[PDB]
UniProtKB/Swiss-Prot annotation, chains A, B:
The gene is S. This is Spike protein S1. Attaches the virion to the cell membrane by interacting with host receptor, initiating the infection. The major receptor is host ACE2. When S2/S2' has been cleaved, binding to the receptor triggers direct fusion at the cell membrane. When S2/S2' has not been cleaved, binding to the receptor results in internalization of the virus by endocytosis using host TFRC and GRM2 and leading to fusion of the virion membrane with the host endosomal membrane. Alternatively, may use NRP1/NRP2 and integrin as entry receptors. The chain holds residues 447 to 496 of 1273 of the full protein. Changing residue 47 to Y: Reduced host ACE2-binding affinity in vitro. Changing residue 50 to S: In strain: Omicron/BA.1.
Amino acid sequence: GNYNYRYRLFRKSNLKPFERDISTEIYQAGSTPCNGVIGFNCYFPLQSYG
Amino acid sequence: GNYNYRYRLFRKSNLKPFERDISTEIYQAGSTPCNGVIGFNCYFPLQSYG
């Protein structure tokens, strides 16, 4: 596996044309404020191709 | 996507039978140390199924 290539899988809104998002903030997918820690319903925004 | 189910993708050694691993330390896959930060050759050990 080559896991050094990542893609943004979760975002609040769709991107504008020619816009990039290099921010690494934990995406809340529920109703729980989980303070930037991965776990239940808090996922990392970037996922590896592998 | 249901990303609440995760599996450990990276480990230094194989498991003994009936052994569990709940650690979340960053798997160093290169010469450079990771310092607990994801990036190039430093991966999170648990990956969601999707």
